[PDB]
Ligand binder design. Structure first.
Ligand SMILES: [K+]
Ligand SMILES: [K+]
Ligand SMILES: [K+]
Ligand SMILES: [K+]
Ligand SMILES: [K+]
Ligand SMILES: [K+]
Ligand SMILES: [K+]
Ligand SMILES: [K+]
Ligand SMILES: [K+]
Ligand SMILES: [K+]
Ligand SMILES: [K+]
Ligand SMILES: [K+]
Ligand SMILES: [K+]
Ligand SMILES: [K+]
Ligand SMILES: [K+]
Ligand SMILES: [K+]
Ligand SMILES: [K+]
Ligand SMILES: [K+]
Ligand SMILES: [K+]
Ligand SMILES: [K+]
Ligand SMILES: [K+]
Ligand SMILES: [K+]
Ligand SMILES: [K+]
Ligand SMILES: [K+]
Ligand SMILES: [K+]
Ligand SMILES: [K+]
Ligand SMILES: [K+]
Ligand SMILES: [K+]
Ligand SMILES: [Mg+2]
Ligand SMILES: [Mg+2]
Ligand SMILES: [Mg+2]
Ligand SMILES: [Mg+2]
Ligand SMILES: [Mg+2]
Ligand SMILES: [Mg+2]
Ligand SMILES: [Mg+2]
Ligand SMILES: [Mg+2]
Ligand SMILES: [Mg+2]
Ligand SMILES: [Mg+2]
Ligand SMILES: [Mg+2]
Ligand SMILES: [Mg+2]
Ligand SMILES: [Mg+2]
Ligand SMILES: [Mg+2]
Ligand SMILES: [Mg+2]
Ligand SMILES: [Mg+2]
Ligand SMILES: [Mg+2]
Ligand SMILES: [Mg+2]
Ligand SMILES: [Mg+2]
Ligand SMILES: [Mg+2]
Ligand SMILES: [Mg+2]
Ligand SMILES: [Mg+2]
Ligand SMILES: [Mg+2]
Ligand SMILES: [Mg+2]
Ligand SMILES: [Mg+2]
Ligand SMILES: [Mg+2]
Ligand SMILES: [Mg+2]
Ligand SMILES: [Mg+2]
Ligand SMILES: [Mg+2]
Ligand SMILES: [Mg+2]
Ligand SMILES: [Mg+2]
Ligand SMILES: [Mg+2]
Ligand SMILES: [Mg+2]
Lengths: 61, 101, 91, 59
RNA sequence: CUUCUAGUGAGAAAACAACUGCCCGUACCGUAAACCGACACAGGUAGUCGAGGAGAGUAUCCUAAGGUGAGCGAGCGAACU
RNA sequence: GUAUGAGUAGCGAAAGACAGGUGAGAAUCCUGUCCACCGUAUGACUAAGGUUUCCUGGGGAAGGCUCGUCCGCCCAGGGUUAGUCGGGACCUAAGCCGAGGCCGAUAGGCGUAGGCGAUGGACAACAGGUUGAUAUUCCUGUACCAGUUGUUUUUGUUUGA
RNA sequence: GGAGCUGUAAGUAAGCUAUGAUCCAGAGAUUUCCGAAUGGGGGAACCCAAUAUCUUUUAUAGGAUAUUACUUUUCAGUGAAUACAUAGCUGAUUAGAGGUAGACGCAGAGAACUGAAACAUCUUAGUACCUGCAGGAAGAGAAAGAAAAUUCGAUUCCCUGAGUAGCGGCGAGCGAAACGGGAAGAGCCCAAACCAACAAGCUUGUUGGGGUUGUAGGACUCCGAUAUGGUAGUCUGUUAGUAUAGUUGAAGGAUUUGGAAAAUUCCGCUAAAGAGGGUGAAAGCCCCGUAGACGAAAUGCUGACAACACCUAGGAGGAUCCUGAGUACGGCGGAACACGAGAAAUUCCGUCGGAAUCCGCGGGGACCAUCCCGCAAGGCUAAAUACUCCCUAGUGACCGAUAGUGAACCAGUACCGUGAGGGAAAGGUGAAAAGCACCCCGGAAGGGGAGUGAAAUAGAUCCUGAAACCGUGUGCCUACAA
């Protein structure tokens, strides 16, 4: 699924609030990016959140 | 049932009250019993039953088991039945005398 | 299945009796039995030599008694033809 | 009966089963015609086979 | 299915004789009283054959092969429809 | 549940007649004769669909728009025979399913390989007879297709059919 | 358990049973095909395979058994672009799929009718529905808390606080929490520092030890102890109980009416049993039972006991070291807190930026200071609580056949619909079939006798048998009347 492979961030539901406070459902998505990373020593393209990459601990092979 | 096939019983209720006779057949599921010469009925039989007249047969019809009492063979009187084990074997016993069966 | 269970019973009717005069015998066989298996079963059971086997499926037939209605069981009818110079089957 | 079946041996039991199967086969044929009188024999033979198979399995 | 080699190869081919060849459907109605229309319903239902005279013709009329006489009738012979 | 309307509307395209029979009972069932209707059909085959309505012997409660001795109804027995016909053990179209795979809040959507899927392609048997009911299926006759075993005859055995 | 039995279900027919049947309870065997369906296919209950062994046939054809889906875990072998490798492929190994109970839990996603007397914020409502995961319970739970009486000491649920404080086009409405009183009670593990071992390539990873906190704890250094207590462990036994069949279990006869006695009348008798049901009408004493006593080969379950297993150290020092980071927090956009951005804490999601670390950090409803309380960013944890598809035993100022389940009866049936789906009607002879032999009319049906029965106007369309409606007989009236 389209889920951050490391932090689990995933699409969720939010609201739109007009100035008249009208509410309508929307989708709030995490800033996922396809990244080639080493899992169990083998590189693979997986979804990853920019936040997960920010620390720099996540490989970027 | 407390009564058995072949037992000698006395009728304590019904039109045939105070009669006595042998139990020709017992039907535990119906809780009924047939006593020879007791509760006789005239039955209109067609000649289809291998009787080449059909006729009006006479036969005993079952009566409820609660309407009879076992005749104590030793004394010739009707009695209630208890259950006592004798020689390691369970058997019926006349409450009025203690006689067996 | 077992050879003895392959054949269920003979079929006795006017058509079956005419077949017997022609040296062809009608049997009800296990509904899952094929004519080759029936051939093997008849040979082993009766010591006859089978020339040919014709096989039909008899459909379940509707029936009713009183308020209840249903279908007779489906049947599989086989007409077994013995070769000439073969012993006859006896029933 | 069950005692006899247990007394018998493996080969004896299998041969007995085969004889019973042939007897059941013949009984079916005689029932299909009018030549069978003791109908209860059919159920007796079937139960005999059942007992034999049960003993064999529990050996 | 026919050919090509690749591969595979000690058996092949022919005639003759004998023998083997499984499962499912097979009834019956089917321009209909048996299917779709609640009906033994003037409707609908794909494909094939579908003769003769006159005739261009499968039109039309009368017929062949073949099928059918329609599941309320008998009287009367007014109005009106 | 039962009235009223009311013993009224209706009884659903059309030709029947008489003799005989059967039977408790006949316009209505059977036989016969004449007559009449359809005849690119109202005939003969079939696919679908129906699912025993098929045949034989019984029945007249209900159903049949009347009647019924009759029936596609009820009761009891019985009837569908394939190497070659149609389908499967053959092929594929549209479409469908879909290992991995792609995508996606969940559910799932899409899709490769591979499959399924005829309405098409491929494929060996015909004539006659026979039953109350089946027939290119059973029988008679004469065939064909794939294969097994065996006898015989020819040839090839590793520069090898 | 002890005499009949082969169901409903009559009838024949043939049989079984004291060599103990039928029947009842525990355990086991067999358990076709479809169905997640899983060898492949498929329009479910069908078709067609491969492999291996066996089997039929002189042989082909035929038959039987076992294995063969996909993915996940782990191992092994093979093995590309490409050299090493990896991917892929093969085999093995492993545990998943699916269904429920129309209930209860948690989570994702998430309406409208409705209310506001219109309507958009708001309300219905985080409800209905959909989906995922579940467990017998779930969730929560061991203070970065509640407070400020000075204190309390995980969580959950109940009463109360209270329709209060509050929120709200300040409208309609929504609506707490803490204290207090109860149910129940239980607390525990890691990460880190540090030590040992190991492998690589002085740190850096695996294993082990060590440690688990706020009146700060721990490491580390000294000492002194090698006990003391405990468990929320075990298909480990022993024992007891209990569930799943059962045994036993008191005491009435007459008279009257009656077809029949349990009713009436006279005498009795029993009661640890006068609960209830049946029996030809209403039975303490006829029957099944009840009070009471007793019973288990087998399989479960519970509780103990044992065994095994696993946790369980005190004091003194701080020189140094550790105590959860893209975390807390902030901006922006949403959401949850009764709280609708509001002065707005607190909690959570997305995006971006982004700390301190014991002289530290968080909270006490903007925010600062002081004081007080606590120690997040790791995990687990029984009971009190919610629910009942089922099983056992019972209850009812609950229904009594248009009621009560839709269904007392062959009901989710008949029937309707392409399908999802919708969905009925229908209980009562008699004490006992004793279900009307025989005769007469009739083709039958149906009747009249004759019988059975207490009753047949109880005759199977059968207890009672209302009204509508139909009909026969007639006491009175009616053909000049609106
Ligand atoms: K060639
Ligand atoms: K046919
Ligand atoms: K012409
Ligand atoms: K013409
Ligand atoms: K007619
Ligand atoms: K007239
Ligand atoms: K006119
Ligand atoms: K009417
Ligand atoms: K009328
Ligand atoms: K007839
Ligand atoms: K064929
Ligand atoms: K075709
Ligand atoms: K499937
Ligand atoms: K439930
Ligand atoms: K609304
Ligand atoms: K309003
Ligand atoms: K829990
Ligand atoms: K309140
Ligand atoms: K308002
Ligand atoms: K420890
Ligand atoms: K009695
Ligand atoms: K009583
Ligand atoms: K036990
Ligand atoms: K706030
Ligand atoms: K606080
Ligand atoms: K605190
Ligand atoms: K009566
Ligand atoms: K009158
Ligand atoms: Mg066939
Ligand atoms: Mg035909
Ligand atoms: Mg028509
Ligand atoms: Mg047309
Ligand atoms: Mg009129
Ligand atoms: Mg007509
Ligand atoms: Mg024309
Ligand atoms: Mg006919
Ligand atoms: Mg007929
Ligand atoms: Mg009629
Ligand atoms: Mg074909
Ligand atoms: Mg697809
Ligand atoms: Mg897939
Ligand atoms: Mg052909
Ligand atoms: Mg025909
Ligand atoms: Mg399968
Ligand atoms: Mg409104
Ligand atoms: Mg569970
Ligand atoms: Mg403190
Ligand atoms: Mg007693
Ligand atoms: Mg008394
Ligand atoms: Mg809110
Ligand atoms: Mg804060
Ligand atoms: Mg933020
Ligand atoms: Mg404050
Ligand atoms: Mg709990
Ligand atoms: Mg009533
Ligand atoms: Mg009802
Ligand atoms: Mg109802
Ligand atoms: Mg009366
Ligand atoms: Mg009545
Ligand atoms: Mg006048
Ligand atoms: Mg007058």
């Amino acid at each position: 699924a389209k889920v951050c492979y490391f932090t689990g961030r995933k699409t969720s539901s939010g609201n739109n609030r007009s100035h008249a406070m009208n509410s309508t459902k929307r989708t709030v998505k995490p800033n996922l990016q396809k990244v080639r990373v080493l899992i169990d020593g083998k590189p693979k393209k997986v979804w990853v959140s920019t936040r997960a990459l920010k620390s720099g601990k996540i490989e970027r092979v | 049932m407390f009564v058995k096939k072949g037992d000698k019983v006395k009728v304590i209720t019904g039109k045939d009250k105070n009669k006595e006779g042998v139990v020709l057949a017992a039907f535990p599921k119906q809780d009924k019993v047939i006593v020879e010469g007791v509760n006789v009925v005239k039955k209109h039989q067609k000649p289809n039953q291998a009787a080449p007249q059909g006729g009006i047969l006479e036969v005993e019809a079952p009566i409820h088991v609660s309407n009879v009492m076992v005749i104590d063979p030793s004394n010739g009187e009707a009695t209630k039945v208890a259950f006592k084990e004798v020689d390691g074997k369970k058997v019926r016993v006349s409450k009025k005398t203690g006689e067996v069966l | 299945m077992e050879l003895l269970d392959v054949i269920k019973r003979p079929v006795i009717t006017e058509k079956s009796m005419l077949a017997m005069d022609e040296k062809k015998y009608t049997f009800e066989v296990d509904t899952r039995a094929n004519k080759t298996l029936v051939k093997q079963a008849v040979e082993s059971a009766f010591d006859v030599k089978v020339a040919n086997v014709n096989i039909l499926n008899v459909r379940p037939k509707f029936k009713r008694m009183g308020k209840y209605a249903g279908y007779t069981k489906k049947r599989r009818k086989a007409i077994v033809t013995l070769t000439e110079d073969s012993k006859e089957i006896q029933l | 009966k069950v005692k006899e079946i247990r007394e018998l041996t493996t080969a004896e039991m299998l041969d007995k089963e085969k004889q019973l199967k042939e007897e059941l086969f013949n009984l079916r044929f005689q029932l299909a015609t009018g030549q069978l009188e003791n109908t209860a024999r059919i159920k007796e033979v079937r139960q005999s086979i059942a007992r034999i198979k049960t003993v064999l399995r529990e050996q």
